[PDB]
């Protein structure tokens, strides 16, 4: 979807809504993150921040009763924002599927910033840094090689 081999949807061909575009823009309409689960409940269905976090938590546990209630609140919440009910529910099914794999973006990002810093350094002054890389694995002959 990044390189034009498939049409980009926000998030699915059928089950998409244009209000999800600013949330899903950076990932080409793919629901990748814990935080996207929560932004979809904010934007699509008008959740509070704290109720949004409670939905993502309930998606981790995957319990029977749990969902059943939120499933209803999320239906009439979308209805109240004029977004189609069947679309809202069928998107909820996709959110729930991808929530199982969903990684913590904020945790990934804090660390990814440090990767970018080591990347920039290596590109702009990549001798000292390499020396440091060697020091990190100094005792290992195999790694040094």
């Amino acid at each position: 979807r990044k390189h034009g081999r498939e049409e980009i949807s926000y998030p699915d061909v059928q089950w998409q809504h244009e209000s999800l575009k600013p949330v899903l823009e950076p990932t080409y309409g793919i629901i990748l993150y814990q935080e996207q689960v929560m932004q979809i409940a904010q934007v699509l269905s008008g959740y509070t921040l704290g109720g949004a976090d409670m939905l993502r938590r309930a998606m981790g546990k995957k319990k029977p009763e749990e969902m059943a209630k939120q499933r209803s609140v999320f239906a009439e919440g979308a209805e109240k924002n004029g977004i189609n009910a069947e679309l809202a529910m069928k998107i909820f099914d996709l959110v729930e599927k991808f929530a199982g794999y969903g990684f913590n973006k904020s945790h990934s990002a804090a660390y990814a910033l440090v990767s970018y810093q080591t990347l920039w350094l290596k590109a702009h002054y990549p001798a000292e840094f390499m020396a440091a890389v060697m020091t990190a694995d100094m005792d290992n002959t195999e790694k040094v090689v």
């Binding site: 921040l49 945790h107 804090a110 660390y111 910033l113 440090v114």
Partner: protein, 73 residues
């Protein structure tokens, strides 16, 4: 004390991130509103001592020679 050092810490960041003052004004409201929304939950949950310990600790180790890793949960 927390509210103060956070609003004023945000003022440093804002001038570093958006050193054009015209843009800082137009981009600013979102941050102030987010700041106070978070500030409300932190204070009403009753953790201000905790946040103070940690912020001081983090700052001191930057001033002196302790690089801190990305991790923060």
């Amino acid at each position: 004390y927390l509210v103060k050092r956070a609003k004023e810490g945000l003022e440093e960041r804002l001038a570093f991130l958006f050193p054009d003052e015209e843009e800082r004004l137009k981009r600013r409201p979102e941050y102030d509103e987010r700041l106070e929304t978070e500030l409300q939950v932190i204070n009403q949950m009753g953790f201000p001592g905790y946040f103070l310990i940690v912020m001081e600790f983090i700052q001191w180790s930057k001033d002196n020679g302790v690089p801190v890793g990305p991790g923060r949960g």
